Design a protein around this ligand. Sequence first.
Ligand SMILES: *P(=O)(O)OCC(C)(C)[C@@H](O)C(=O)NCCC(=O)NCCSC(=O)CCCCCCCCCCC
Ligand SMILES: *Cc1c(COP(=O)(O)O)cnc(C)c1O
Lengths: 71, 291, 75
Amino acid sequence: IEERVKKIIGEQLGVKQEEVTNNASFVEDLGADSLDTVELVMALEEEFDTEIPDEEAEKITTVQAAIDYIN
Amino acid sequence: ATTPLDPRVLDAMLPYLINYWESEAAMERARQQVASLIGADPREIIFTSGATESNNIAIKGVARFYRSRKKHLITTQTEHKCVLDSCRSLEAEGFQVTYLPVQKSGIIDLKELEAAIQPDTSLVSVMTVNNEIGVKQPIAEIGRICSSRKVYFHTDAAQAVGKIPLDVNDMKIDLMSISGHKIYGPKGVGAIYIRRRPTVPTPLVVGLGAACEVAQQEMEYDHKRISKLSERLIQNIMKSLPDVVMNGDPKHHYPGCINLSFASSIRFGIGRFTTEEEVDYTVEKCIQHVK
Amino acid sequence: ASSRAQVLALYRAMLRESKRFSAYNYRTYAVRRIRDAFRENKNVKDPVEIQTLVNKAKRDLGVIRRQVHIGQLYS
Ligand SMILES: *P(=O)(O)OCC(C)(C)[C@@H](O)C(=O)NCCC(=O)NCCSC(=O)CCCCCCCCCCC
Ligand SMILES: *Cc1c(COP(=O)(O)O)cnc(C)c1O
């Protein structure tokens, strides 16, 4: 895909591509904790080399928030 | 058989590498670090150039000090090359030295040991750990024998410090050799532990002390880590070739040293900073060796 | 004390800094060591304990920063 974000989050939280939806919350749908969070938001720039700041990242709890922030 | 320098220990020595009092305090800190790792007093720790110097002080030290009463020393046939060179020198000086063989298990026979003790033995020197195949020697039991027999007990722990727990009084150690760059510290530094009755550049001694503290803090984590990677190595070779065997008594292996045999034998080393990629490489580069 | 977002920013900081180690083994050991350490001590419930482990964390972050910066001095 072009917005192939479900591969990075699937690879970080150990979930198959079927469970990663678009309205999936990382904490209560992909079953994560606040360390998996910083690991995943840190792994997104491994694909895109961005710099999502400390202040404007706490509300990216959904996967579609990730694809929308990248886009 | 050296190890890479741990960035934490380098961080410790760097203040002392850039300017040349504070020396006494830094050295006292370092020697209580060593002592705390091995369970000794700080007064019982003396810094050296490395385990070679420590071994020569211990072995030639006791040997020459008691020459007028005792002439026999006991070691093992597989000690470090410089221990054996020193003992050859002592033999040329007039000492008689028993070189004990280690069994197929890699452990010395305690009955052979105490049978070897004579009325004129001053010193027993036994490696803490079999570096070749990966077993621990029964240090505590040997210290018991030597204590009953009134013998000085020295052990070479260069390859053992930081990998397995050590306590000088439990094992009845009289002398112990320690090497700095065998535990991710710097080359050129060592320690000898000498039990008490009741010169060396300070950046290197604070390096040794830092390495010792890091080891004492990292022993369990590194233990089960090196263990995990060892199981990956052994089980991965065993899956691609079921003929290979792991030598040494399995009840006495320690993490970091694996000796496998084919049908000759080859030895692997796993330590702190070893990655899963390296284990996954040398498992196949060795499997490619299809003799 | 030291809240929760404090230790989260801390953990983020040690991951970020440890990723800048020039040597491979030092960086994988650093991030694996940090991950395992925080995850193991995640559900600690003693404050006098917690502030001790974040004190140690700060010290270690100090050394990590110093030696990645030194490593970048030679490139
Ligand atoms: P999440 O569930 O929201 O996470 C928040 C948590 C649960 C973590 C938080 O609320 C909490 O309860 N914490 C309890 C205690 C705690 O988190 N302590 C943190 C300190 S852990 C520590 O000591 C890390 C040590 C790292 C050492 C690495 C060494 C690197 C070596 C470098 C040289 C190569
Ligand atoms: C490396 C080693 C030594 C020598 O230690 P140095 O500090 O290099 O002198 C002595 N004994 C054993 C078992 C060793 O592995």
